Amino acid sequence: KAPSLKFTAPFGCEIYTNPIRAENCAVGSIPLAFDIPDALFTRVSETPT
Amino acid sequence: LSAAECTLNECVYSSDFGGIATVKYSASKSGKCAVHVPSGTATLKEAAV
Protein backbone atom coordinates (compact mmCIF):
# COMPACT_ATOMS: atom_id res chain seq x y z
CA LYS A 1 0.00 0.00 0.00
CA ALA A 2 3.08 2.31 -0.03
CA PRO A 3 3.92 4.71 2.83
CA SER A 4 1.06 6.86 4.05
CA LEU A 5 0.81 10.64 3.86
CA LYS A 6 2.70 10.83 7.16
CA PHE A 7 5.81 10.03 5.12
CA THR A 8 4.92 11.24 1.60
CA ALA A 9 3.01 14.51 2.02
CA PRO A 10 4.85 17.54 0.57
CA PHE A 11 5.94 20.52 2.67
CA GLY A 12 6.46 18.25 5.68
CA CYS A 13 2.80 18.11 6.67
CA GLU A 14 1.86 16.04 9.71
CA ILE A 15 -1.16 13.86 8.94
CA TYR A 16 -3.59 13.16 11.77
CA THR A 17 -6.93 11.39 12.11
CA ASN A 18 -10.16 12.17 14.00
CA PRO A 19 -10.60 14.60 12.40
CA ILE A 20 -8.62 13.92 9.23
CA ARG A 21 -6.30 16.92 9.09
CA ALA A 22 -2.87 18.16 8.09
CA GLU A 23 -0.72 20.21 10.43
CA ASN A 24 2.24 22.56 10.11
CA CYS A 25 2.26 22.63 6.30
CA ALA A 26 4.97 25.16 5.43
CA VAL A 27 3.28 26.47 2.29
CA GLY A 28 1.81 29.89 1.59
CA SER A 29 1.29 32.85 3.88
CA ILE A 30 -1.64 34.12 5.95
CA PRO A 31 -2.67 37.75 5.29
CA LEU A 32 -3.56 39.34 8.63
CA ALA A 33 -5.87 42.34 8.93
CA PHE A 34 -5.90 44.29 12.20
CA ASP A 35 -8.48 46.88 13.24
CA ILE A 36 -7.12 48.80 16.24
CA PRO A 37 -9.43 51.38 17.85
CA ASP A 38 -7.97 54.85 18.23
CA ALA A 39 -8.05 54.53 22.03
CA LEU A 40 -5.05 52.17 22.09
CA PHE A 41 -2.74 54.76 20.47
CA THR A 42 -1.24 56.74 23.36
CA ARG A 43 0.75 59.97 23.19
CA VAL A 44 4.43 60.29 22.30
CA SER A 45 5.30 62.06 25.55
CA GLU A 46 4.01 59.15 27.65
CA THR A 47 6.34 56.65 26.00
CA PRO A 48 10.12 57.10 26.37
CA THR A 49 11.68 59.33 23.72
CA LEU B 1 15.70 85.10 30.61
CA SER B 2 18.91 84.00 28.91
CA ALA B 3 20.07 80.98 26.89
CA ALA B 4 16.66 79.54 26.01
CA GLU B 5 16.02 77.06 23.20
CA CYS B 6 12.62 75.69 22.13
CA THR B 7 12.11 72.11 20.94
CA LEU B 8 8.82 70.61 19.72
CA ASN B 9 9.09 67.14 21.21
CA GLU B 10 5.46 66.44 20.23
CA CYS B 11 2.85 68.09 18.01
CA VAL B 12 -0.50 67.07 16.57
CA TYR B 13 -2.69 69.75 14.99
CA SER B 14 -5.83 68.77 16.88
CA SER B 15 -8.58 71.03 18.17
CA ASP B 16 -7.34 70.82 21.76
CA PHE B 17 -3.80 71.53 23.03
CA GLY B 18 -2.13 68.93 20.86
CA GLY B 19 1.42 70.18 21.22
CA ILE B 20 4.17 70.32 23.86
CA ALA B 21 7.15 72.67 23.61
CA THR B 22 10.17 72.24 25.89
CA VAL B 23 12.35 75.32 26.43
CA LYS B 24 15.83 75.10 27.95
CA TYR B 25 16.44 78.21 30.05
CA SER B 26 19.24 79.72 32.15
CA ALA B 27 17.47 82.54 33.99
CA SER B 28 18.89 85.16 36.33
CA LYS B 29 16.50 84.21 39.14
CA SER B 30 13.26 82.41 39.91
CA GLY B 31 9.97 84.12 39.18
CA LYS B 32 6.89 84.17 36.97
CA CYS B 33 6.96 84.66 33.19
CA ALA B 34 4.07 85.84 31.01
CA VAL B 35 4.66 83.32 28.23
CA HIS B 36 2.86 84.35 25.05
CA VAL B 37 2.95 83.97 21.27
CA PRO B 38 2.34 87.37 19.59
CA SER B 39 1.57 85.60 16.31
CA GLY B 40 -1.59 83.61 15.70
CA THR B 41 0.25 80.40 14.81
CA ALA B 42 -0.31 78.80 18.23
CA THR B 43 -2.58 79.25 21.24
CA LEU B 44 -1.03 78.71 24.66
CA LYS B 45 -2.79 76.81 27.43
CA GLU B 46 -0.75 78.62 30.10
CA ALA B 47 -0.65 82.41 30.29
CA ALA B 48 2.12 82.26 32.92
CA VAL B 49 4.92 79.84 33.76
Side-chain angles (χ1 to χ4, degrees):
Chain A
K1 46 181 177 166
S4 158
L5 287 180
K6 283 170 56 175
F7 313 121
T8 68
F11 301 116
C13 297
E14 280 108 330
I15 303 295
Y16 293 108
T17 317
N18 284 349
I20 300 179
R21 71 216 186 255
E23 279 176 21
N24 305 331
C25 296
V27 57
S29 65
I30 305 149
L32 275 297
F34 298 84
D35 173 18
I36 304 96
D38 291 356
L40 270 75
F41 294 103
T42 180
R43 284 217 292 187
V44 170
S45 77
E46 292 183 354
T47 199
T49 294
Chain B
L1 201 71
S2 63
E5 183 180 3
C6 192
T7 50
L8 284 200
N9 50 9
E10 161 197 353
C11 187
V12 298
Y13 50 102
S14 46
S15 296
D16 71 305
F17 303 119
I20 284 182
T22 300
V23 290
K24 310 296 189 291
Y25 63 90
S26 296
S28 67
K29 56 188 177 293
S30 292
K32 184 64 66 68
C33 280
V35 56
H36 171 82
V37 177
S39 178
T41 315
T43 286
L44 261 53
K45 177 176 174 64
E46 302 115 307
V49 61

Coordinates of all heavy atoms in Angstrom, one line a residue:
Chain A
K1 N 0.8 -1.2 0.0 CA 0.0 0.0 0.0 C 0.8 1.3 0.0 O 0.2 2.4 0.0 CB -0.9 0.0 1.2 CG -0.3 -0.4 2.5 CD -1.3 -0.4 3.7 CE -0.6 -0.8 4.9 NZ -1.5 -0.5 6.1
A2 N 2.2 1.2 0.0 CA 3.1 2.3 0.0 C 3.0 3.1 1.3 O 2.0 3.0 2.0 CB 2.8 3.2 -1.2
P3 N 4.0 3.9 1.6 CA 3.9 4.7 2.8 C 2.8 5.7 2.8 O 2.4 6.2 1.7 CB 5.3 5.4 2.9 CG 6.2 4.6 2.1 CD 5.3 4.0 1.0
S4 N 2.2 6.0 3.9 CA 1.1 6.9 4.0 C 1.5 8.3 3.8 O 2.6 8.6 3.6 CB 0.4 6.7 5.4 OG -0.4 7.8 5.7
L5 N 0.5 9.2 4.0 CA 0.8 10.6 3.9 C 1.6 11.2 5.0 O 2.1 12.3 4.9 CB -0.5 11.4 3.7 CG -1.3 11.3 2.4 CD1 -2.5 12.2 2.5 CD2 -0.4 11.8 1.2
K6 N 1.8 10.4 6.1 CA 2.7 10.8 7.2 C 4.1 10.9 6.6 O 4.9 11.8 7.1 CB 2.7 9.8 8.3 CG 1.5 10.0 9.2 CD 1.4 8.8 10.2 CE 2.7 8.7 11.0 NZ 2.6 7.6 12.0
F7 N 4.5 10.1 5.6 CA 5.8 10.0 5.1 C 6.0 10.5 3.7 O 7.1 10.6 3.2 CB 6.3 8.6 5.2 CG 6.0 7.9 6.5 CD1 5.3 6.8 6.6 CD2 6.6 8.5 7.7 CE1 5.0 6.2 7.9 CE2 6.3 7.9 8.9 CZ 5.6 6.7 9.0
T8 N 4.9 10.8 3.0 CA 4.9 11.2 1.6 C 4.3 12.6 1.3 O 4.5 13.1 0.2 CB 4.2 10.2 0.7 OG1 2.8 10.2 1.0 CG2 4.8 8.8 1.0
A9 N 3.6 13.2 2.3 CA 3.0 14.5 2.0 C 4.1 15.6 1.8 O 5.1 15.7 2.5 CB 2.1 14.9 3.2
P10 N 3.9 16.5 0.8 CA 4.8 17.5 0.6 C 4.8 18.6 1.7 O 3.8 18.6 2.5 CB 4.4 18.1 -0.8 CG 3.5 17.1 -1.4 CD 2.8 16.4 -0.2
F11 N 5.8 19.4 1.7 CA 5.9 20.5 2.7 C 6.1 20.1 4.1 O 5.9 20.9 5.0 CB 4.8 21.5 2.6 CG 4.6 22.1 1.2 CD1 3.5 21.9 0.4 CD2 5.6 22.9 0.7 CE1 3.4 22.4 -0.8 CE2 5.5 23.5 -0.6 CZ 4.4 23.3 -1.3
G12 N 6.3 18.8 4.3 CA 6.5 18.3 5.7 C 5.2 18.4 6.5 O 5.3 18.7 7.7
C13 N 4.1 18.1 5.9 CA 2.8 18.1 6.7 C 2.7 16.9 7.6 O 3.2 15.8 7.3 CB 1.6 18.1 5.7 SG 1.5 19.5 4.6
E14 N 2.2 17.1 8.8 CA 1.9 16.0 9.7 C 0.4 15.6 9.5 O -0.5 16.5 9.6 CB 2.1 16.5 11.2 CG 3.6 16.4 11.6 CD 4.2 17.8 11.7 OE1 3.7 18.7 11.0 OE2 5.1 17.9 12.6
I15 N 0.2 14.4 9.3 CA -1.2 13.9 8.9 C -1.8 13.2 10.2 O -1.2 12.2 10.7 CB -1.1 12.9 7.7 CG1 -0.5 13.6 6.5 CG2 -2.5 12.4 7.4 CD1 -1.3 14.8 6.0
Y16 N -2.9 13.7 10.6 CA -3.6 13.2 11.8 C -5.0 12.8 11.4 O -5.6 13.2 10.5 CB -3.6 14.2 12.9 CG -2.2 14.5 13.4 CD1 -1.5 15.7 13.2 CD2 -1.5 13.5 14.2 CE1 -0.3 15.9 13.7 CE2 -0.3 13.8 14.7 CZ 0.3 15.0 14.4 OH 1.6 15.2 14.9
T17 N -5.6 11.9 12.3 CA -6.9 11.4 12.1 C -7.8 11.8 13.3 O -7.3 12.1 14.4 CB -6.9 9.9 12.0 OG1 -5.8 9.5 11.1 CG2 -8.2 9.3 11.4
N18 N -9.1 11.8 13.0 CA -10.2 12.2 14.0 C -9.9 13.6 14.6 O -9.6 13.7 15.7 CB -10.2 11.1 15.1 CG -10.9 9.8 14.7 OD1 -11.5 9.8 13.7 ND2 -10.7 8.8 15.5
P19 N -10.2 14.6 13.8 CA -10.6 14.6 12.4 C -9.4 14.5 11.4 O -8.3 14.8 11.8 CB -11.3 15.9 12.2 CG -10.6 16.8 13.2 CD -10.1 16.0 14.3
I20 N -9.7 14.0 10.2 CA -8.6 13.9 9.2 C -8.1 15.3 8.9 O -8.9 16.2 8.4 CB -9.1 13.2 8.0 CG1 -9.6 11.8 8.3 CG2 -8.1 13.2 6.9 CD1 -10.2 11.1 7.1
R21 N -6.8 15.6 9.2 CA -6.3 16.9 9.1 C -4.8 16.8 8.8 O -4.2 15.8 9.0 CB -6.6 17.8 10.3 CG -5.7 17.4 11.5 CD -6.5 17.6 12.8 NE -5.7 17.3 14.0 CZ -5.8 16.2 14.8 NH1 -6.6 15.3 14.5 NH2 -5.0 16.1 15.8
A22 N -4.3 17.9 8.3 CA -2.9 18.2 8.1 C -2.4 19.3 9.0 O -3.2 20.2 9.3 CB -2.5 18.5 6.6
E23 N -1.2 19.2 9.5 CA -0.7 20.2 10.4 C 0.7 20.7 10.0 O 1.5 19.9 9.5 CB -0.7 19.6 11.8 CG -2.0 19.7 12.5 CD -2.0 19.0 13.9 OE1 -0.9 18.9 14.5 OE2 -3.1 18.6 14.4
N24 N 0.9 22.0 10.3 CA 2.2 22.6 10.1 C 2.8 22.4 8.7 O 3.9 22.1 8.5 CB 3.2 22.0 11.1 CG 2.8 22.2 12.6 OD1 2.0 23.1 12.9 ND2 3.2 21.3 13.4
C25 N 1.9 22.6 7.7 CA 2.3 22.6 6.3 C 2.9 24.0 6.0 O 2.3 25.0 6.1 CB 1.0 22.4 5.4 SG 0.3 20.8 5.6
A26 N 4.2 23.9 5.7 CA 5.0 25.2 5.4 C 4.8 25.6 4.0 O 5.8 25.7 3.2 CB 6.4 24.9 5.8
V27 N 3.6 26.0 3.6 CA 3.3 26.5 2.3 C 2.4 27.7 2.4 O 1.5 27.7 3.3 CB 2.6 25.4 1.4 CG1 1.4 24.8 2.1 CG2 2.3 25.9 0.0
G28 N 2.6 28.7 1.6 CA 1.8 29.9 1.6 C 2.0 30.8 2.8 O 2.8 30.5 3.7
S29 N 1.2 31.9 2.8 CA 1.3 32.9 3.9 C -0.1 33.3 4.2 O -1.0 33.3 3.3 CB 2.2 34.1 3.5 OG 1.6 34.8 2.4
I30 N -0.3 33.7 5.5 CA -1.6 34.1 6.0 C -1.7 35.6 6.0 O -0.8 36.3 6.7 CB -1.9 33.6 7.4 CG1 -1.8 32.0 7.4 CG2 -3.3 34.0 7.8 CD1 -1.3 31.5 8.7
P31 N -2.5 36.3 5.2 CA -2.7 37.7 5.3 C -3.5 38.1 6.5 O -4.7 37.8 6.6 CB -3.4 38.1 4.0 CG -4.1 36.9 3.6 CD -3.3 35.7 4.1
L32 N -2.9 38.9 7.4 CA -3.6 39.3 8.6 C -4.1 40.8 8.5 O -3.4 41.6 7.9 CB -2.6 39.3 9.8 CG -2.4 38.0 10.6 CD1 -3.7 37.6 11.3 CD2 -1.9 36.9 9.7
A33 N -5.3 41.0 8.9 CA -5.9 42.3 8.9 C -6.3 42.7 10.4 O -7.1 42.0 11.0 CB -7.1 42.4 8.0
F34 N -5.6 43.8 10.9 CA -5.9 44.3 12.2 C -6.8 45.5 12.1 O -6.6 46.4 11.2 CB -4.6 44.7 12.9 CG -3.7 43.5 13.2 CD1 -2.8 43.1 12.2 CD2 -3.7 42.8 14.4 CE1 -1.9 42.0 12.4 CE2 -2.8 41.8 14.6 CZ -2.0 41.4 13.6
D35 N -7.7 45.7 13.0 CA -8.5 46.9 13.2 C -8.3 47.3 14.7 O -8.8 46.6 15.6 CB -10.0 46.7 12.9 CG -10.8 47.9 13.3 OD1 -10.2 49.0 13.5 OD2 -12.0 47.7 13.4
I36 N -7.5 48.3 14.9 CA -7.1 48.8 16.2 C -7.9 50.1 16.5 O -7.8 51.0 15.7 CB -5.6 49.1 16.4 CG1 -4.8 47.8 16.0 CG2 -5.3 49.6 17.8 CD1 -4.3 47.8 14.6
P37 N -8.7 50.1 17.5 CA -9.4 51.4 17.9 C -8.4 52.5 18.2 O -7.3 52.2 18.7 CB -10.3 51.0 19.0 CG -9.7 49.8 19.7 CD -9.0 49.1 18.5
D38 N -8.9 53.7 18.0 CA -8.0 54.9 18.2 C -7.6 55.0 19.7 O -6.6 55.7 20.0 CB -8.6 56.1 17.7 CG -8.7 56.2 16.2 OD1 -8.2 55.3 15.5 OD2 -9.3 57.2 15.7
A39 N -8.3 54.4 20.6 CA -8.0 54.5 22.0 C -6.7 53.9 22.4 O -6.1 54.4 23.4 CB -9.2 53.9 22.9
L40 N -6.3 52.9 21.7 CA -5.0 52.2 22.1 C -3.8 53.0 21.7 O -2.7 52.6 22.3 CB -5.0 50.8 21.4 CG -5.6 49.6 22.2 CD1 -7.1 49.7 22.2 CD2 -5.1 48.3 21.7
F41 N -3.9 54.0 20.9 CA -2.7 54.8 20.5 C -2.5 55.9 21.5 O -3.3 56.9 21.5 CB -2.9 55.3 19.1 CG -3.0 54.2 18.0 CD1 -4.2 53.8 17.4 CD2 -1.8 53.6 17.6 CE1 -4.2 52.8 16.5 CE2 -1.8 52.6 16.6 CZ -3.0 52.2 16.1
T42 N -1.5 55.7 22.3 CA -1.2 56.7 23.4 C -0.4 57.9 22.8 O -0.2 57.9 21.6 CB -0.5 56.1 24.5 OG1 -0.3 57.1 25.5 CG2 0.8 55.4 24.1
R43 N 0.0 58.8 23.6 CA 0.8 60.0 23.2 C 2.2 59.7 23.2 O 2.7 58.7 23.8 CB 0.5 61.2 24.1 CG -0.9 61.8 23.9 CD -0.8 63.3 24.1 NE -0.6 63.7 25.4 CZ -0.6 64.9 25.9 NH1 -0.8 66.0 25.1 NH2 -0.4 65.2 27.2
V44 N 3.0 60.5 22.4 CA 4.4 60.3 22.3 C 5.1 60.6 23.6 O 6.1 60.0 24.0 CB 5.0 61.1 21.1 CG1 6.5 61.1 21.1 CG2 4.5 60.6 19.8
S45 N 4.6 61.6 24.3 CA 5.3 62.1 25.6 C 5.2 61.0 26.6 O 6.2 60.8 27.4 CB 4.7 63.3 26.1 OG 3.4 63.1 26.7
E46 N 4.1 60.2 26.6 CA 4.0 59.2 27.7 C 5.1 58.1 27.5 O 5.6 57.6 28.5 CB 2.6 58.6 27.6 CG 1.5 59.5 28.0 CD 0.1 58.9 28.1 OE1 0.0 57.7 27.6 OE2 -0.8 59.6 28.5
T47 N 5.3 57.6 26.2 CA 6.3 56.7 26.0 C 7.7 57.3 26.1 O 7.9 58.5 25.9 CB 6.1 56.0 24.6 OG1 6.9 54.7 24.6 CG2 6.7 56.9 23.5
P48 N 8.8 56.5 26.4 CA 10.1 57.1 26.4 C 10.5 57.6 25.0 O 10.1 57.0 24.0 CB 11.0 55.9 26.8 CG 10.1 55.1 27.6 CD 8.7 55.2 27.0
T49 N 11.2 58.7 25.0 CA 11.7 59.3 23.7 C 13.2 59.2 23.7 O 13.9 59.6 24.7 CB 11.2 60.8 23.6 OG1 9.8 60.9 23.5 CG2 11.9 61.5 22.4
Chain B
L1 N 15.4 86.4 31.2 CA 15.7 85.1 30.6 C 17.0 85.2 29.8 O 17.2 86.2 29.1 CB 14.5 84.6 29.8 CG 14.5 83.1 29.5 CD1 14.2 82.3 30.7 CD2 13.6 82.8 28.4
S2 N 17.7 84.1 29.7 CA 18.9 84.0 28.9 C 19.2 82.5 28.6 O 18.9 81.6 29.4 CB 20.1 84.6 29.6 OG 20.4 83.9 30.8
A3 N 19.7 82.3 27.4 CA 20.1 81.0 26.9 C 18.9 80.0 26.9 O 18.9 79.0 27.7 CB 21.2 80.4 27.7
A4 N 17.9 80.3 26.1 CA 16.7 79.5 26.0 C 16.5 79.0 24.6 O 16.7 79.7 23.6 CB 15.4 80.4 26.4
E5 N 16.2 77.7 24.5 CA 16.0 77.1 23.2 C 14.7 76.2 23.2 O 14.5 75.5 24.2 CB 17.2 76.2 22.8 CG 17.1 75.5 21.5 CD 18.3 74.6 21.2 OE1 19.2 74.5 22.0 OE2 18.4 74.1 20.1
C6 N 13.9 76.3 22.2 CA 12.6 75.7 22.1 C 12.7 74.5 21.2 O 13.2 74.6 20.1 CB 11.5 76.7 21.6 SG 9.8 76.1 21.8
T7 N 12.2 73.3 21.7 CA 12.1 72.1 20.9 C 10.7 71.6 21.0 O 10.1 71.5 22.1 CB 13.1 71.1 21.5 OG1 12.9 70.9 22.9 CG2 14.5 71.4 21.2
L8 N 10.2 71.2 19.8 CA 8.8 70.6 19.7 C 9.0 69.1 19.8 O 9.0 68.4 18.8 CB 8.2 71.0 18.4 CG 7.6 72.5 18.3 CD1 6.6 72.6 17.2 CD2 7.0 72.9 19.7
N9 N 9.0 68.6 21.0 CA 9.1 67.1 21.2 C 7.8 66.4 20.8 O 7.9 65.1 20.7 CB 9.5 66.8 22.7 CG 8.6 67.5 23.7 OD1 7.6 68.1 23.3 ND2 9.0 67.5 24.9
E10 N 6.7 67.1 20.6 CA 5.5 66.4 20.2 C 4.5 67.5 19.7 O 4.3 68.5 20.3 CB 4.8 65.7 21.4 CG 3.4 65.4 21.2 CD 2.7 65.1 22.6 OE1 3.4 64.9 23.6 OE2 1.5 64.9 22.6
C11 N 3.9 67.2 18.6 CA 2.8 68.1 18.0 C 1.9 67.3 17.2 O 2.3 66.6 16.2 CB 3.5 69.2 17.2 SG 2.3 70.5 16.7
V12 N 0.6 67.5 17.4 CA -0.5 67.1 16.6 C -1.5 68.2 16.4 O -1.8 68.9 17.4 CB -1.2 65.8 17.1 CG1 -0.3 64.6 17.1 CG2 -1.8 66.0 18.5
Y13 N -1.8 68.6 15.2 CA -2.7 69.8 15.0 C -4.2 69.4 15.2 O -5.0 69.3 14.3 CB -2.4 70.4 13.6 CG -2.5 69.4 12.4 CD1 -3.6 69.4 11.6 CD2 -1.3 68.7 12.1 CE1 -3.6 68.5 10.5 CE2 -1.3 67.8 11.0 CZ -2.5 67.8 10.2 OH -2.5 67.0 9.1
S14 N -4.5 69.1 16.5 CA -5.8 68.8 16.9 C -6.5 70.0 17.4 O -5.9 71.1 17.6 CB -5.8 67.7 18.0 OG -4.8 67.9 18.9
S15 N -7.8 69.9 17.7 CA -8.6 71.0 18.2 C -8.1 71.5 19.5 O -8.0 72.7 19.8 CB -10.1 70.7 18.2 OG -10.6 70.4 16.9
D16 N -7.8 70.5 20.4 CA -7.3 70.8 21.8 C -5.8 71.1 21.7 O -5.2 71.3 20.7 CB -7.7 69.7 22.7 CG -6.8 68.4 22.4 OD1 -6.8 68.0 21.3 OD2 -6.2 68.0 23.4
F17 N -5.2 71.2 22.9 CA -3.8 71.5 23.0 C -3.0 70.3 22.7 O -2.6 69.5 23.5 CB -3.5 72.0 24.4 CG -4.3 73.2 24.8 CD1 -5.1 73.2 25.9 CD2 -4.2 74.4 24.1 CE1 -5.9 74.3 26.3 CE2 -4.9 75.5 24.5 CZ -5.8 75.4 25.6
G18 N -2.8 70.1 21.4 CA -2.1 68.9 20.9 C -0.7 69.1 20.6 O -0.1 68.6 19.6
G19 N 0.0 70.0 21.4 CA 1.4 70.2 21.2 C 2.1 70.5 22.5 O 1.6 71.2 23.4
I20 N 3.3 70.0 22.7 CA 4.2 70.3 23.9 C 5.5 70.9 23.4 O 6.1 70.3 22.5 CB 4.4 69.1 24.7 CG1 3.1 68.8 25.5 CG2 5.6 69.3 25.7 CD1 3.3 67.6 26.5
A21 N 5.9 72.0 23.9 CA 7.2 72.7 23.6 C 8.0 72.7 24.9 O 7.5 73.2 25.9 CB 6.9 74.1 23.1
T22 N 9.2 72.2 24.8 CA 10.2 72.2 25.9 C 11.2 73.3 25.6 O 11.9 73.3 24.6 CB 10.8 70.9 26.1 OG1 9.8 69.9 26.3 CG2 11.8 70.9 27.2
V23 N 11.4 74.2 26.6 CA 12.4 75.3 26.4 C 13.4 75.2 27.5 O 13.1 75.0 28.7 CB 11.7 76.7 26.5 CG1 10.8 76.9 25.3 CG2 10.8 76.8 27.8
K24 N 14.7 75.1 27.1 CA 15.8 75.1 27.9 C 16.2 76.5 28.3 O 16.4 77.4 27.4 CB 17.0 74.4 27.3 CG 16.7 73.0 26.7 CD 16.3 72.0 27.8 CE 16.1 70.6 27.3 NZ 15.0 70.5 26.4
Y25 N 16.2 76.8 29.6 CA 16.4 78.2 30.1 C 17.5 78.3 31.1 O 17.7 77.3 31.9 CB 15.1 78.8 30.6 CG 14.6 78.1 31.8 CD1 15.0 78.4 33.1 CD2 13.7 77.0 31.7 CE1 14.5 77.8 34.2 CE2 13.3 76.3 32.8 CZ 13.6 76.7 34.1 OH 13.2 76.0 35.2
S26 N 18.2 79.4 31.1 CA 19.2 79.7 32.2 C 18.9 81.1 32.6 O 19.5 82.1 32.1 CB 20.7 79.6 31.6 OG 21.0 78.3 31.2
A27 N 18.0 81.2 33.6 CA 17.5 82.5 34.0 C 18.3 83.1 35.1 O 19.1 82.5 35.8 CB 16.0 82.4 34.4
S28 N 18.2 84.5 35.3 CA 18.9 85.2 36.3 C 18.4 84.8 37.7 O 19.2 84.6 38.7 CB 18.8 86.7 36.1 OG 17.4 87.1 36.3
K29 N 17.1 84.5 37.9 CA 16.5 84.2 39.1 C 15.1 83.6 38.9 O 14.6 83.6 37.8 CB 16.4 85.4 40.0 CG 15.6 86.6 39.4 CD 15.7 87.8 40.3 CE 15.0 89.0 39.6 NZ 15.7 89.4 38.4
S30 N 14.6 83.0 40.0 CA 13.3 82.4 39.9 C 12.2 83.5 39.8 O 12.4 84.6 40.3 CB 13.0 81.5 41.1 OG 13.8 80.4 41.1
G31 N 11.1 83.2 39.3 CA 10.0 84.1 39.2 C 8.8 83.6 38.3 O 8.7 82.4 38.2
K32 N 8.0 84.5 37.8 CA 6.9 84.2 37.0 C 7.0 84.9 35.6 O 7.4 86.1 35.6 CB 5.6 84.6 37.6 CG 4.3 84.2 36.9 CD 4.2 82.7 36.8 CE 4.0 82.1 38.1 NZ 2.6 82.4 38.7
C33 N 6.8 84.1 34.5 CA 7.0 84.7 33.2 C 5.6 84.6 32.5 O 4.9 83.6 32.5 CB 8.0 83.8 32.4 SG 9.7 84.3 32.8
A34 N 5.3 85.7 31.8 CA 4.1 85.8 31.0 C 4.4 85.3 29.6 O 4.7 86.0 28.7 CB 3.6 87.3 31.0
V35 N 4.3 84.0 29.5 CA 4.7 83.3 28.2 C 3.5 83.5 27.2 O 2.3 83.4 27.6 CB 4.9 81.8 28.5 CG1 3.8 81.1 29.1 CG2 5.3 81.1 27.2
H36 N 3.9 84.0 26.0 CA 2.9 84.3 25.1 C 3.5 84.2 23.7 O 4.7 84.4 23.5 CB 2.3 85.8 25.3 CG 1.5 86.3 24.2 ND1 0.1 86.0 24.1 CD2 1.7 87.1 23.2 CE1 -0.4 86.6 23.1 NE2 0.6 87.3 22.5
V37 N 2.6 84.0 22.7 CA 2.9 84.0 21.3 C 2.3 85.2 20.6 O 1.0 85.1 20.4 CB 2.6 82.7 20.6 CG1 2.9 82.7 19.1 CG2 3.3 81.5 21.2
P38 N 3.0 86.2 20.3 CA 2.3 87.4 19.6 C 1.6 87.0 18.3 O 0.6 87.6 18.0 CB 3.5 88.3 19.4 CG 4.7 87.5 19.4 CD 4.4 86.4 20.4
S39 N 2.2 86.0 17.5 CA 1.6 85.6 16.3 C 0.4 84.7 16.6 O 0.2 84.2 17.7 CB 2.6 84.9 15.4 OG 2.0 84.4 14.2
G40 N -0.4 84.5 15.6 CA -1.6 83.6 15.7 C -1.3 82.2 15.3 O -2.3 81.4 15.2
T41 N -0.1 81.8 15.2 CA 0.2 80.4 14.8 C -0.2 79.4 15.9 O -0.7 78.3 15.5 CB 1.7 80.3 14.5 OG1 2.2 81.4 13.8 CG2 2.0 79.0 13.8
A42 N 0.0 79.7 17.1 CA -0.3 78.8 18.2 C -1.1 79.5 19.3 O -0.9 80.7 19.5 CB 1.0 78.2 18.8
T43 N -1.9 78.8 20.1 CA -2.6 79.2 21.2 C -2.1 78.5 22.5 O -2.0 77.3 22.5 CB -4.1 79.0 21.1 OG1 -4.6 80.0 20.1 CG2 -4.8 79.2 22.4
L44 N -1.7 79.3 23.5 CA -1.0 78.7 24.7 C -2.0 78.4 25.8 O -2.9 79.2 26.1 CB 0.0 79.7 25.2 CG 1.5 79.4 24.7 CD1 1.6 79.2 23.2 CD2 2.4 80.5 25.2
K45 N -1.9 77.2 26.3 CA -2.8 76.8 27.4 C -2.5 77.6 28.7 O -3.4 78.1 29.4 CB -2.6 75.3 27.7 CG -3.4 74.8 28.9 CD -3.3 73.3 29.1 CE -4.0 72.9 30.4 NZ -5.4 73.1 30.4
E46 N -1.2 77.9 28.9 CA -0.8 78.6 30.1 C -0.4 80.1 29.7 O 0.4 80.3 28.8 CB 0.5 77.9 30.7 CG 0.2 76.5 31.1 CD 1.1 75.5 30.3 OE1 1.0 75.6 29.1 OE2 1.8 74.7 30.9
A47 N -1.0 81.0 30.5 CA -0.7 82.4 30.3 C 0.5 82.8 31.2 O 1.0 84.0 31.0 CB -1.9 83.3 30.6
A48 N 1.0 82.0 32.1 CA 2.1 82.3 32.9 C 2.8 81.0 33.3 O 2.1 79.9 33.4 CB 1.7 83.0 34.2
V49 N 4.1 81.0 33.5 CA 4.9 79.8 33.8 C 5.9 80.2 34.8 O 6.5 81.3 34.9 CB 5.6 79.3 32.5 CG1 6.5 80.4 31.9 CG2 6.4 78.0 32.8

